[PDB]
Every structure is written in C-alpha cells, then in structure tokens.
PDB file of C-alpha atoms in Angstrom:
ATOM      1  CA  UNK A  18     259.278-117.094  89.027  1.00 53.45           C
ATOM      2  CA  UNK A  19     260.877-118.022  92.856  1.00 53.44           C
ATOM      3  CA  UNK A  20     262.516-120.364  94.491  1.00 51.40           C
ATOM      4  CA  UNK A  21     261.915-118.514  98.683  1.00 53.39           C
ATOM      5  CA  UNK A  22     259.275-118.973 100.084  1.00 53.11           C
ATOM      6  CA  UNK A  23     255.778-116.728  99.857  1.00 57.56           C
ATOM      7  CA  UNK A  24     253.080-116.741 102.883  1.00 53.41           C
ATOM      8  CA  UNK A  25     250.257-115.583 103.478  1.00 56.97           C
ATOM      9  CA  UNK A  26     249.488-116.309 107.289  1.00 56.24           C
ATOM     10  CA  UNK A  27     251.119-118.454 109.634  1.00 57.17           C
ATOM     11  CA  UNK A  28     250.903-119.676 112.890  1.00 58.09           C
ATOM     12  CA  UNK A  29     253.875-121.524 113.592  1.00 58.57           C
ATOM     13  CA  UNK A  30     255.125-124.210 111.590  1.00 61.34           C
ATOM     14  CA  UNK A  31     258.722-124.554 109.863  1.00 60.58           C
ATOM     15  CA  UNK A  32     259.534-122.914 106.354  1.00 61.13           C
ATOM     16  CA  UNK A  33     262.790-123.982 104.700  1.00 60.34           C
ATOM     17  CA  UNK A  34     262.630-123.027 101.338  1.00 59.36           C
TER      18      UNK A  34
ATOM     19  CA  UNK B  26     278.552-136.743 119.949  1.00 63.17           C
ATOM     20  CA  UNK B  27     274.558-137.808 121.498  1.00 60.12           C
ATOM     21  CA  UNK B  28     271.594-135.513 121.113  1.00 61.90           C
ATOM     22  CA  UNK B  29     269.001-136.402 123.596  1.00 64.59           C
ATOM     23  CA  UNK B  30     266.143-134.290 123.411  1.00 62.46           C
ATOM     24  CA  UNK B  31     263.490-135.543 126.276  1.00 62.10           C
ATOM     25  CA  UNK B  32     260.877-133.569 128.333  1.00 60.26           C
ATOM     26  CA  UNK B  33     258.519-135.723 132.031  1.00 61.36           C
ATOM     27  CA  UNK B  34     255.211-134.684 133.115  1.00 60.68           C
ATOM     28  CA  UNK B  35     254.445-135.333 136.997  1.00 59.65           C
ATOM     29  CA  UNK B  36     250.393-135.711 137.382  1.00 60.92           C
ATOM     30  CA  UNK B  37     249.422-136.119 141.126  1.00 58.51           C
ATOM     31  CA  UNK B  38     245.555-136.247 141.989  1.00 60.64           C
TER      32      UNK B  38
ATOM     33  CA  UNK C   6     257.916-120.914  87.788  1.00 61.03           C
ATOM     34  CA  UNK C   7     258.004-121.938  91.083  1.00 62.59           C
ATOM     35  CA  UNK C   8     260.979-124.666  93.345  1.00 62.02           C
ATOM     36  CA  UNK C   9     260.093-122.106  96.076  1.00 61.34           C
ATOM     37  CA  UNK C  10     257.463-123.200  98.272  1.00 64.65           C
ATOM     38  CA  UNK C  11     253.263-120.181  97.924  1.00 64.46           C
ATOM     39  CA  UNK C  12     251.418-121.259 101.230  1.00 61.59           C
ATOM     40  CA  UNK C  13     247.882-119.453 101.668  1.00 62.81           C
ATOM     41  CA  UNK C  14     247.466-120.349 105.647  1.00 61.18           C
ATOM     42  CA  UNK C  15     249.312-122.924 107.682  1.00 62.84           C
ATOM     43  CA  UNK C  16     248.612-123.622 110.860  1.00 63.13           C
ATOM     44  CA  UNK C  17     251.532-125.435 112.479  1.00 61.94           C
ATOM     45  CA  UNK C  18     253.779-128.660 109.574  1.00 66.02           C
ATOM     46  CA  UNK C  19     257.417-128.844 107.768  1.00 62.32           C
ATOM     47  CA  UNK C  20     257.510-127.466 105.000  1.00 64.95           C
ATOM     48  CA  UNK C  21     260.732-127.943 103.322  1.00 64.61           C
ATOM     49  CA  UNK C  22     260.543-126.540  99.165  1.00 62.78           C
TER      50      UNK C  22
ATOM     51  CA  UNK D  28     262.157-112.718  91.106  1.00 63.84           C
ATOM     52  CA  UNK D  29     262.564-113.776  95.106  1.00 65.30           C
ATOM     53  CA  UNK D  30     264.896-116.238  96.673  1.00 65.96           C
ATOM     54  CA  UNK D  31     264.042-114.380  99.563  1.00 64.77           C
ATOM     55  CA  UNK D  32     261.052-114.797 102.009  1.00 63.42           C
ATOM     56  CA  UNK D  33     258.051-112.739 101.569  1.00 64.68           C
ATOM     57  CA  UNK D  34     255.218-112.803 104.624  1.00 63.15           C
ATOM     58  CA  UNK D  35     252.246-111.296 105.110  1.00 62.53           C
ATOM     59  CA  UNK D  36     251.054-112.203 108.881  1.00 60.93           C
ATOM     60  CA  UNK D  37     253.790-114.265 110.938  1.00 62.13           C
ATOM     61  CA  UNK D  38     252.893-116.161 113.841  1.00 63.02           C
ATOM     62  CA  UNK D  39     256.038-117.870 115.604  1.00 63.13           C
ATOM     63  CA  UNK D  40     257.123-120.758 113.635  1.00 64.13           C
ATOM     64  CA  UNK D  41     260.809-120.670 111.628  1.00 65.95           C
ATOM     65  CA  UNK D  42     261.441-119.812 107.866  1.00 66.60           C
ATOM     66  CA  UNK D  43     265.101-119.942 106.222  1.00 64.31           C
ATOM     67  CA  UNK D  44     264.586-118.772 103.360  1.00 64.86           C
TER      68      UNK D  44
ATOM     69  CA  UNK E   1     280.150-132.231 122.180  1.00 64.18           C
ATOM     70  CA  UNK E   2     276.088-133.264 123.020  1.00 64.76           C
ATOM     71  CA  UNK E   3     273.519-131.244 122.720  1.00 62.65           C
ATOM     72  CA  UNK E   4     270.849-132.181 125.288  1.00 62.12           C
ATOM     73  CA  UNK E   5     267.495-130.328 126.179  1.00 60.59           C
ATOM     74  CA  UNK E   6     265.057-131.344 128.661  1.00 64.29           C
ATOM     75  CA  UNK E   7     262.100-130.361 130.083  1.00 62.25           C
ATOM     76  CA  UNK E   8     260.273-131.507 133.514  1.00 59.84           C
ATOM     77  CA  UNK E   9     256.639-130.480 134.998  1.00 61.30           C
ATOM     78  CA  UNK E  10     255.594-131.364 138.356  1.00 60.86           C
ATOM     79  CA  UNK E  11     252.591-131.173 139.993  1.00 58.94           C
ATOM     80  CA  UNK E  12     250.748-131.783 142.908  1.00 59.00           C
ATOM     81  CA  UNK E  13     246.908-131.669 143.774  1.00 55.43           C
TER      82      UNK E  13
ATOM     83  CA  UNK F  20     281.362-128.740 124.170  1.00 57.20           C
ATOM     84  CA  UNK F  21     277.829-129.548 124.806  1.00 58.20           C
ATOM     85  CA  UNK F  22     274.837-126.632 124.650  1.00 57.19           C
ATOM     86  CA  UNK F  23     271.795-128.243 127.219  1.00 56.58           C
ATOM     87  CA  UNK F  24     269.213-125.876 128.261  1.00 55.50           C
ATOM     88  CA  UNK F  25     267.009-127.103 130.224  1.00 59.21           C
ATOM     89  CA  UNK F  26     264.065-126.293 132.359  1.00 60.99           C
ATOM     90  CA  UNK F  27     262.025-127.226 135.363  1.00 61.36           C
ATOM     91  CA  UNK F  28     258.503-126.029 136.511  1.00 63.34           C
ATOM     92  CA  UNK F  29     257.286-127.591 140.103  1.00 62.79           C
ATOM     93  CA  UNK F  30     254.167-126.519 141.771  1.00 61.43           C
ATOM     94  CA  UNK F  31     252.158-128.188 144.948  1.00 60.88           C
ATOM     95  CA  UNK F  32     248.673-127.317 145.191  1.00 60.42           C
TER      96      UNK F  32
ATOM     97  CA  UNK G  24     276.619-126.688 106.075  1.00 60.56           C
ATOM     98  CA  UNK G  25     273.183-128.265 107.102  1.00 58.21           C
ATOM     99  CA  UNK G  26     269.995-126.945 108.564  1.00 60.26           C
ATOM    100  CA  UNK G  27     268.882-127.842 111.665  1.00 61.69           C
ATOM    101  CA  UNK G  28     265.651-126.810 113.934  1.00 62.91           C
ATOM    102  CA  UNK G  29     264.977-128.103 117.326  1.00 64.71           C
ATOM    103  CA  UNK G  30     261.213-127.213 119.556  1.00 64.83           C
ATOM    104  CA  UNK G  31     260.107-128.938 122.187  1.00 67.22           C
ATOM    105  CA  UNK G  32     256.888-128.051 123.743  1.00 67.55           C
ATOM    106  CA  UNK G  33     254.512-128.701 127.003  1.00 66.83           C
ATOM    107  CA  UNK G  34     250.979-127.382 127.770  1.00 66.46           C
ATOM    108  CA  UNK G  35     249.279-127.695 130.080  1.00 67.60           C
ATOM    109  CA  UNK G  36     244.820-126.751 130.938  1.00 66.73           C
ATOM    110  CA  UNK G  37     243.021-126.422 133.306  1.00 63.86           C
ATOM    111  CA  UNK G  38     239.218-127.078 133.304  1.00 61.94           C
ATOM    112  CA  UNK G  39     237.941-124.747 130.612  1.00 61.43           C
ATOM    113  CA  UNK G  40     240.087-122.656 128.711  1.00 60.45           C
ATOM    114  CA  UNK G  41     238.579-120.890 125.391  1.00 61.11           C
ATOM    115  CA  UNK G  42     235.421-122.199 125.845  1.00 61.74           C
ATOM    116  CA  UNK G  43     232.702-120.441 124.111  1.00 62.99           C
ATOM    117  CA  UNK G  44     230.289-122.277 126.872  1.00 64.78           C
ATOM    118  CA  UNK G  45     226.562-120.280 126.915  1.00 67.52           C
ATOM    119  CA  UNK G  46     227.902-117.633 124.156  1.00 68.29           C
ATOM    120  CA  UNK G  47     225.841-116.731 121.880  1.00 67.89           C
ATOM    121  CA  UNK G  48     227.717-116.851 118.521  1.00 67.56           C
ATOM    122  CA  UNK G  49     226.283-115.233 114.919  1.00 63.76           C
ATOM    123  CA  UNK G  50     229.077-115.164 112.587  1.00 63.09           C
ATOM    124  CA  UNK G  51     229.111-114.198 109.518  1.00 62.57           C
ATOM    125  CA  UNK G  52     232.084-114.269 106.626  1.00 63.46           C
ATOM    126  CA  UNK G  53     230.032-113.126 103.408  1.00 61.02           C
ATOM    127  CA  UNK G  54     226.824-113.842 102.360  1.00 59.05           C
ATOM    128  CA  UNK G  55     223.544-111.529 102.398  1.00 56.86           C
ATOM    129  CA  UNK G  56     221.359-110.966 104.731  1.00 57.01           C
ATOM    130  CA  UNK G  57     217.656-109.314 103.795  1.00 53.24           C
ATOM    131  CA  UNK G  58     215.670-109.184 106.088  1.00 51.08           C
TER     132      UNK G  58
ATOM    133  CA  UNK H  10     278.641-122.409 107.891  1.00 52.45           C
ATOM    134  CA  UNK H  11     275.240-124.049 109.357  1.00 53.41           C
ATOM    135  CA  UNK H  12     271.527-122.615 110.536  1.00 52.27           C
ATOM    136  CA  UNK H  13     270.568-124.048 113.976  1.00 55.45           C
ATOM    137  CA  UNK H  14     267.429-123.131 116.279  1.00 53.31           C
ATOM    138  CA  UNK H  15     266.005-124.401 119.458  1.00 54.23           C
ATOM    139  CA  UNK H  16     263.465-123.041 121.145  1.00 52.30           C
ATOM    140  CA  UNK H  17     261.697-124.712 124.184  1.00 49.41           C
ATOM    141  CA  UNK H  18     258.194-123.635 125.645  1.00 52.69           C
ATOM    142  CA  UNK H  19     256.362-124.556 128.692  1.00 53.52           C
ATOM    143  CA  UNK H  20     252.794-123.483 129.458  1.00 52.75           C
ATOM    144  CA  UNK H  21     250.595-123.358 132.127  1.00 54.58           C
ATOM    145  CA  UNK H  22     246.953-122.363 132.228  1.00 52.84           C
ATOM    146  CA  UNK H  23     245.103-121.657 134.702  1.00 52.64           C
ATOM    147  CA  UNK H  24     241.201-122.467 135.839  1.00 52.26           C
ATOM    148  CA  UNK H  25     239.726-120.682 132.076  1.00 49.93           C
ATOM    149  CA  UNK H  26     242.195-118.483 129.604  1.00 48.02           C
ATOM    150  CA  UNK H  27     240.711-116.776 127.214  1.00 46.66           C
ATOM    151  CA  UNK H  28     237.908-118.018 127.429  1.00 46.12           C
ATOM    152  CA  UNK H  29     234.248-116.042 126.170  1.00 46.94           C
ATOM    153  CA  UNK H  30     232.104-118.369 128.747  1.00 46.04           C
ATOM    154  CA  UNK H  31     228.438-116.473 128.868  1.00 44.97           C
ATOM    155  CA  UNK H  32     229.481-113.527 126.363  1.00 46.06           C
ATOM    156  CA  UNK H  33     227.438-112.382 123.473  1.00 48.18           C
ATOM    157  CA  UNK H  34     229.667-112.158 119.961  1.00 46.42           C
ATOM    158  CA  UNK H  35     227.999-110.337 117.101  1.00 45.89           C
ATOM    159  CA  UNK H  36     230.867-110.379 113.805  1.00 42.67           C
ATOM    160  CA  UNK H  37     230.548-110.032 110.361  1.00 36.10           C
ATOM    161  CA  UNK H  38     233.623-110.105 108.066  1.00 36.72           C
ATOM    162  CA  UNK H  39     232.626-108.445 104.986  1.00 39.95           C
ATOM    163  CA  UNK H  40     229.092-108.846 103.688  1.00 36.74           C
ATOM    164  CA  UNK H  41     225.813-107.250 104.023  1.00 38.13           C
ATOM    165  CA  UNK H  42     223.057-107.361 105.933  1.00 40.66           C
ATOM    166  CA  UNK H  43     219.767-105.175 105.040  1.00 38.59           C
ATOM    167  CA  UNK H  44     217.279-104.879 107.768  1.00 37.87           C
TER     168      UNK H  44
ATOM    169  CA  UNK I  29     280.340-118.485 110.153  1.00 39.21           C
ATOM    170  CA  UNK I  30     277.043-120.078 111.151  1.00 35.79           C
ATOM    171  CA  UNK I  31     273.929-118.609 112.679  1.00 36.36           C
ATOM    172  CA  UNK I  32     272.530-120.216 115.892  1.00 34.28           C
ATOM    173  CA  UNK I  33     269.022-118.770 117.690  1.00 31.03           C
ATOM    174  CA  UNK I  34     267.978-120.012 120.822  1.00 28.03           C
ATOM    175  CA  UNK I  35     264.844-119.640 122.868  1.00 25.11           C
ATOM    176  CA  UNK I  36     263.156-120.309 126.293  1.00 26.81           C
ATOM    177  CA  UNK I  37     260.328-119.798 127.923  1.00 28.15           C
ATOM    178  CA  UNK I  38     258.628-120.284 131.131  1.00 25.71           C
ATOM    179  CA  UNK I  39     254.778-119.457 130.715  1.00 27.74           C
ATOM    180  CA  UNK I  40     252.155-119.698 133.846  1.00 29.99           C
ATOM    181  CA  UNK I  41     248.573-118.093 133.813  1.00 32.73           C
ATOM    182  CA  UNK I  42     246.364-117.640 136.953  1.00 31.58           C
ATOM    183  CA  UNK I  43     242.384-117.873 136.349  1.00 33.12           C
ATOM    184  CA  UNK I  44     241.017-116.079 133.518  1.00 35.76           C
ATOM    185  CA  UNK I  45     243.782-114.119 132.298  1.00 38.20           C
ATOM    186  CA  UNK I  46     242.537-113.143 128.255  1.00 41.43           C
ATOM    187  CA  UNK I  47     239.120-113.291 128.683  1.00 40.31           C
ATOM    188  CA  UNK I  48     236.224-112.449 127.791  1.00 39.21           C
ATOM    189  CA  UNK I  49     233.519-113.810 130.784  1.00 37.36           C
ATOM    190  CA  UNK I  50     229.895-112.507 130.407  1.00 36.52           C
ATOM    191  CA  UNK I  51     231.223-109.492 127.713  1.00 39.06           C
ATOM    192  CA  UNK I  52     229.471-107.921 124.698  1.00 40.24           C
ATOM    193  CA  UNK I  53     231.219-107.377 121.425  1.00 40.21           C
ATOM    194  CA  UNK I  54     230.289-106.241 118.401  1.00 41.16           C
ATOM    195  CA  UNK I  55     233.100-106.256 115.791  1.00 37.31           C
ATOM    196  CA  UNK I  56     232.786-105.552 112.655  1.00 35.25           C
ATOM    197  CA  UNK I  57     236.018-106.337 109.826  1.00 34.08           C
ATOM    198  CA  UNK I  58     234.708-104.519 106.220  1.00 32.04           C
ATOM    199  CA  UNK I  59     231.358-105.361 105.689  1.00 34.30           C
ATOM    200  CA  UNK I  60     227.805-103.121 104.916  1.00 35.14           C
ATOM    201  CA  UNK I  61     224.825-102.820 107.569  1.00 33.03           C
ATOM    202  CA  UNK I  62     221.686-101.071 105.433  1.00 28.20           C
ATOM    203  CA  UNK I  63     219.261-100.486 109.197  1.00 29.74           C
TER     204      UNK I  63
ATOM    205  CA  UNK J   3     199.070 -97.984 105.537  1.00 27.17           C
ATOM    206  CA  UNK J   4     201.903 -98.686 102.947  1.00 29.59           C
ATOM    207  CA  UNK J   5     205.300-100.022 102.624  1.00 27.43           C
ATOM    208  CA  UNK J   6     208.006-101.031  99.771  1.00 26.01           C
ATOM    209  CA  UNK J   7     211.487-102.735  99.269  1.00 23.58           C
ATOM    210  CA  UNK J   8     213.925-102.711  96.737  1.00 23.70           C
ATOM    211  CA  UNK J   9     217.522-104.040  96.115  1.00 24.54           C
ATOM    212  CA  UNK J  10     219.247-104.237  93.426  1.00 22.56           C
ATOM    213  CA  UNK J  11     223.087-106.313  93.470  1.00 19.12           C
ATOM    214  CA  UNK J  12     224.795-106.527  90.366  1.00 16.23           C
ATOM    215  CA  UNK J  13     227.446-108.888  91.030  1.00 17.87           C
ATOM    216  CA  UNK J  14     229.430-110.900  93.365  1.00 15.21           C
ATOM    217  CA  UNK J  15     228.387-108.416  96.044  1.00 13.50           C
ATOM    218  CA  UNK J  16     228.549-110.542  99.796  1.00 12.91           C
ATOM    219  CA  UNK J  17     230.971-112.992  97.464  1.00 11.92           C
ATOM    220  CA  UNK J  18     233.918-114.988  98.946  1.00  8.66           C
ATOM    221  CA  UNK J  19     235.212-116.403  95.442  1.00  5.62           C
ATOM    222  CA  UNK J  20     239.163-116.914  95.460  1.00  3.32           C
ATOM    223  CA  UNK J  21     239.571-116.928  99.400  1.00  2.44           C
ATOM    224  CA  UNK J  22     241.544-119.005 101.482  1.00  2.00           C
ATOM    225  CA  UNK J  23     238.950-118.960 105.011  1.00  2.00           C
ATOM    226  CA  UNK J  24     240.405-120.679 108.114  1.00  2.28           C
ATOM    227  CA  UNK J  25     237.392-120.691 111.169  1.00  2.00           C
ATOM    228  CA  UNK J  26     236.947-122.325 114.105  1.00  2.00           C
ATOM    229  CA  UNK J  27     234.262-121.945 116.493  1.00  2.00           C
ATOM    230  CA  UNK J  28     235.031-123.515 119.128  1.00  2.00           C
ATOM    231  CA  UNK J  29     237.359-127.132 119.040  1.00  2.00           C
ATOM    232  CA  UNK J  30     240.909-127.919 120.091  1.00  2.00           C
ATOM    233  CA  UNK J  31     243.284-128.603 116.481  1.00  2.00           C
ATOM    234  CA  UNK J  32     246.705-129.964 117.559  1.00  2.00           C
ATOM    235  CA  UNK J  33     250.271-129.276 115.715  1.00  2.00           C
TER     236      UNK J  33
ATOM    237  CA  UNK K   6     201.932 -93.726 106.337  1.00  2.00           C
ATOM    238  CA  UNK K   7     204.029 -93.650 103.736  1.00  2.00           C
ATOM    239  CA  UNK K   8     207.001 -96.103 103.290  1.00  2.00           C
ATOM    240  CA  UNK K   9     210.116 -96.484 100.986  1.00  2.00           C
ATOM    241  CA  UNK K  10     213.505 -98.038 100.773  1.00  2.00           C
ATOM    242  CA  UNK K  11     215.417 -98.622  97.547  1.00  2.00           C
ATOM    243  CA  UNK K  12     218.940-100.023  97.755  1.00  2.00           C
ATOM    244  CA  UNK K  13     221.463-100.444  94.826  1.00  2.00           C
ATOM    245  CA  UNK K  14     224.901-101.876  94.909  1.00  2.00           C
ATOM    246  CA  UNK K  15     227.036-101.593  91.412  1.00  2.00           C
ATOM    247  CA  UNK K  16     230.179-104.513  92.043  1.00  2.00           C
ATOM    248  CA  UNK K  17     231.559-106.626  95.216  1.00  2.00           C
ATOM    249  CA  UNK K  18     229.983-104.479  97.420  1.00  2.00           C
ATOM    250  CA  UNK K  19     230.890-106.531 100.655  1.00  2.00           C
ATOM    251  CA  UNK K  20     232.576-108.405  98.847  1.00  2.00           C
ATOM    252  CA  UNK K  21     235.402-110.846 100.254  1.00  2.00           C
ATOM    253  CA  UNK K  22     236.851-112.151  97.202  1.00  2.00           C
ATOM    254  CA  UNK K  23     241.083-113.174  96.439  1.00  2.00           C
ATOM    255  CA  UNK K  24     241.203-112.164 100.469  1.00  2.00           C
ATOM    256  CA  UNK K  25     242.904-115.134 103.314  1.00  2.00           C
ATOM    257  CA  UNK K  26     240.758-114.570 106.088  1.00  2.00           C
ATOM    258  CA  UNK K  27     242.532-116.802 109.603  1.00  2.00           C
ATOM    259  CA  UNK K  28     239.234-116.541 112.495  1.00  2.00           C
ATOM    260  CA  UNK K  29     239.093-117.510 116.160  1.00  2.00           C
ATOM    261  CA  UNK K  30     236.503-117.556 118.298  1.00  2.00           C
ATOM    262  CA  UNK K  31     237.459-119.698 120.713  1.00  2.00           C
ATOM    263  CA  UNK K  32     239.206-122.495 121.247  1.00  2.00           C
ATOM    264  CA  UNK K  33     242.432-123.326 121.132  1.00  2.00           C
ATOM    265  CA  UNK K  34     245.724-123.643 118.596  1.00  2.00           C
ATOM    266  CA  UNK K  35     248.833-125.295 119.460  1.00  2.00           C
ATOM    267  CA  UNK K  36     251.204-125.678 117.055  1.00  2.00           C
TER     268      UNK K  36
ATOM    269  CA  UNK L  20     203.940 -89.578 108.189  1.00  2.00           C
ATOM    270  CA  UNK L  21     205.559 -89.876 103.982  1.00  2.00           C
ATOM    271  CA  UNK L  22     209.395 -91.478 105.303  1.00  2.00           C
ATOM    272  CA  UNK L  23     212.098 -92.698 101.904  1.00  2.00           C
ATOM    273  CA  UNK L  24     215.772 -93.376 101.941  1.00  2.00           C
ATOM    274  CA  UNK L  25     217.265 -94.090  99.032  1.00  2.00           C
ATOM    275  CA  UNK L  26     221.062 -96.413  98.932  1.00  2.00           C
ATOM    276  CA  UNK L  27     223.165 -96.197  95.888  1.00  2.00           C
ATOM    277  CA  UNK L  28     227.213 -97.945  96.370  1.00  2.00           C
ATOM    278  CA  UNK L  29     229.497 -97.568  93.056  1.00  2.00           C
ATOM    279  CA  UNK L  30     232.679-100.631  93.921  1.00  2.00           C
ATOM    280  CA  UNK L  31     234.175-102.657  96.566  1.00  5.25           C
ATOM    281  CA  UNK L  32     232.233-100.475  98.870  1.00  6.01           C
ATOM    282  CA  UNK L  33     233.601-102.073 102.573  1.00  6.38           C
ATOM    283  CA  UNK L  34     235.313-104.845 101.003  1.00  6.60           C
ATOM    284  CA  UNK L  35     238.232-106.874 101.503  1.00  6.92           C
ATOM    285  CA  UNK L  36     239.062-108.363  98.950  1.00  5.97           C
ATOM    286  CA  UNK L  37     242.771-109.457  98.409  1.00  6.92           C
ATOM    287  CA  UNK L  38     243.142-108.185 102.253  1.00  6.01           C
ATOM    288  CA  UNK L  39     244.978-110.726 105.318  1.00  7.12           C
ATOM    289  CA  UNK L  40     243.357-111.085 107.989  1.00  5.43           C
ATOM    290  CA  UNK L  41     243.819-112.665 111.266  1.00  2.00           C
ATOM    291  CA  UNK L  42     241.175-112.041 113.609  1.00  3.31           C
ATOM    292  CA  UNK L  43     240.446-113.648 117.310  1.00  5.25           C
ATOM    293  CA  UNK L  44     237.438-112.899 119.329  1.00  7.10           C
ATOM    294  CA  UNK L  45     238.938-115.238 122.663  1.00  5.61           C
ATOM    295  CA  UNK L  46     240.340-119.080 122.419  1.00  6.07           C
ATOM    296  CA  UNK L  47     244.353-119.441 122.661  1.00  5.31           C
ATOM    297  CA  UNK L  48     246.983-119.445 120.106  1.00  8.06           C
ATOM    298  CA  UNK L  49     250.477-121.174 121.085  1.00  7.80           C
ATOM    299  CA  UNK L  50     253.210-121.118 118.830  1.00 10.59           C
TER     300      UNK L  50
END
C-alpha cells in the first residue's frame, strides 16, 4: 500500500503524488 | 493578476 | 494496493497521482 | 505503506509528495 | 500581483 | 507584489 | 492550498555535442559470448 | 498554504561538449564472456 | 505557511568540456570475463 | 596438438529477466 | 601440446534480473 | 607442454540483480 511516490531512476520531470 | 512567461531567441548568421 | 505513483525509469514528463 | 517519497537515483526534476 | 518570468538570448555571428 | 525573474545572454562573434 | 510548478529552459548547442563521430563502441548489457 | 517551484535555466554549449569523437569504448553491464 | 523554491542558472561552455575525444575507455559494471 | 573446452551454465546466467533497460547510443531525446 | 578449459556456472552468474539500468553512450537528453 | 584451467562459480557471481544503475559515457543530460 502507498499513496506517495516510488521511483527507480528519474531524469527531470514532475511527480506530484 | 497575470502570469506571463515568455522567452526569445534572436540569431544572426 | 496503491493510489500513488510507481515508476521504473522516467525521463521528463508529468505524473499527477 | 508510505505517503511520502522513495527515490533510488534522481537527476533533476521535482517531486512533491 | 503579476509573476512574469522571461529570458532572452541574442546571438550575432 | 510582483515576482519577476528574468535572465539574458548577449553574445557577439 | 494549490500546487504550482513552472519550468523554463532555453538550450543552444553548437556543431556536434555528444556525438560518437568516428568512435568504436562495443556494448553488452547481459548476454553470453563463448569465443 | 500552497507549494510553488520555479525553475529557469539557459544553456549554451560550444562545438563538441561531451562527445566521444574518435574514442574506443568497451562497455559491459553484466553478461558473461568466455574467451 | 507555504513553500517556495526558485532556481536560476545560466551556463556557458566552451569548445569541448567533458569530452572523451580520442580516449580509450574500458568499463565493467558487474559481469564475468574468463580470458 | 590437442584442445578442449567445456562450458556448463545452469540457469539465468547472463539474463535480463524482469529488468527495465533504457539504452541510448547517440541520438536525441527531447522531453 | 595439450590444453583444457572447464567452466561451471550455477545461477544468475553475471545476471541483471530485476535491475533498472539507464545507460547512455553519447547522445543528448533534454528534460 | 600441458595446460589446465578449472573455474567453478556458485551463485550471483558478478551479478547486478536488484541494482539501480545510471551510467553515462559521454553525452549530455539537461535536467
């Protein structure tokens, strides 16, 4: 369960969680 | 208010 | 279960979750 | 469970969680 | 208020 | 108030 | 409340930026080679 | 409340920035080579 | 309350910055080589 | 002269199963 | 002249299973 | 002239399983 954000490898970009 | 976002690029060659 | 965001490899782009 | 952010490798970009 | 964000680049060659 | 953020770059060559 | 993300970028590249011109690349992500 | 992120960048690169021109790259991320 | 992040950057690079021109790179992240 | 070469790999040797591989040799990606 | 070479690998030797690999040899990525 | 070479690997020898690998040999990344 999660309502946040889980990212492996991120190059730029916008995540709003 | 107003949120104006512009950007230019002038190039002579 | 999740209502957030799960991303593997992200290059630019917008995610709103 | 998590409502924060979990990131592995991040190069630039915006995360708001 | 107003939040103006601009940026220019002038290049002669 | 107003929050203006600009930046220029002028280049002759 | 309210989120707000602004992003401006202006990019200018000259002749050959980040080019493998004349290079010899040998790359291997996984796999098996029996020589 | 309210979040706010502004980001301006202006980039100018000359002739060959970050280029592998004439290089000999041998790269291996995992894999097996039995020579 | 309220968060606020501003970020300005202006970058100017000359002819060949960070360039592997003419180099010989041998790179190995994991993997097995039995020569 | 003689010669010999035996090779025994059992499972998943050198595999990428389940991986997320983003690869790039030259080219341009905008956004 | 004799010669011999034995090789026994068992599991996942040199494997990338489950990995997130972002790789780049030259090229340009914007944003 | 004799010769011999024995190699025995057990598991995950030289493996990258589960790794997050960001790699870059030349090139440009903006943001």
